[PDB]
Amino acid sequence: GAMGAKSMWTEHKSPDGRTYYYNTETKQSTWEKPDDLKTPAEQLLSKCPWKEYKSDSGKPYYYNSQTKESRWAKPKELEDLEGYQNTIVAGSLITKSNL
Amino acid sequence: GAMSGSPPLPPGAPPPPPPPPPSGSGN
């Protein structure tokens, strides 16, 4: 009944400013954030196949995990994902994509 | 080893270089 059991994943930083999560029972490390540590925001973002990162000039690109495609402009799908604070569901739930 | 200090760093690396942006074709 581990409903109130502390996670075995802890947070640490490397000399490069990077973060690595350690599992204190299995003794295994990862660069990926385990879904048990993911903050609500991350949980929200984590289901979005489109994610924001910046290029060398600071000009943003948005990448899709399913289709593996890259675009310069923000798709509306991500736009509504950001607005997950006012009108949580933008008239539809993310269970029907027309790509 | 590495029982003192900080625990070990994992194999692999989280995408250091940005995945390819469209260079110009149909975008």
From Swiss-Prot, chain A:
N6-acetyllysine carried by residues: 59
Tissue: Expressed in the brain cortex (at protein level). Widely expressed.
Segments forming domain WW: 4-36, 44-77
Coiled-coil stretches: none
Transmembrane segments: none
Cross-link (Glycyl lysine isopeptide (Lys-Gly) (interchain with G-Cter in SUMO2)): 54
Localization terms from the record: Nucleus speckle; Nucleus matrix
Signal peptide: none
Phosphoserine: residues bearing it: 14
Record text about domains: The WW domains are essential for localization to nuclear speckles.
Assembly mode: Interacts with the N-terminus of HTT. Interacts with the phosphorylated C-terminal domain of POLR2A. Interacts with AKAP8L, SF1, SRPK1, ENAH, ATBF1 and MECP2. Interacts through the WW domains with formin proline-rich regions and with WASL/N-WASP.
UniProt family annotation: Belongs to the PRPF40 family.
Function per UniProt: Binds to WASL/N-WASP and suppresses its translocation from the nucleus to the cytoplasm, thereby inhibiting its cytoplasmic function. Plays a role in the regulation of cell morphology and cytoskeletal organization. Required in the control of cell shape and migration. May play a role in cytokinesis. May be involved in pre-mRNA splicing.
Name of this protein: Pre-mRNA-processing factor 40 homolog A
Covered range of the whole protein: 141 to 236 of 957
UniProtKB/Swiss-Prot annotation, chain B:
Biased composition (Pro residues): 7-22
Domain of life: Eukaryota
Tissues in which the UniProt entry reports expression: Detected in lung, ovary, adrenal gland, colon, kidney, muscle, pancreas, thyroid, placenta, brain, liver and heart.
Record localization: Nucleus
Function field: Necessary for the ATP-dependent first step of spliceosome assembly. Binds to the intron branch point sequence (BPS) 5'-UACUAAC-3' of the pre-mRNA. May act as transcription repressor.
Subunit structure comment from the entry: Binds U2AF2. Interacts with U1 snRNA. Binds EWSR1, FUS and TAF15. Interacts with RBM17.
Family as reported in the entry's similarity comment: Belongs to the BBP/SF1 family.
Name used for this protein in its record: Splicing factor 1
Species name: Homo sapiens
Name of the gene: SF1
